Symmetry: none
Subunit: 27 residues, 3 copies
């Protein structure tokens, strides 16, 4: 019969770090 | 003689959400 | 009998980008 399924793939990488936060408030 | 190759393995799951961005620029 | 293992699965896609960072410090 057909052989075993191949190995599962690995889980994906974590996403990219988010954008910078908003500018802080005036002094 | 041996049978046919098995099917392709399962694809991996999508990765997790990326980390928060850095603090914003100063005021 | 069963044939060779099938091809490896593809790895998962990368996760979504993280959220924007927090507001910056005061001036």
């Amino acid at each position: 019969p057909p052989g075993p399924p191949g190995p599962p793939g690995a889980n994906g990488l974590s996403g990219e770090r988010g954008p910078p936060g908003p500018p802080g408030p005036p002094g």
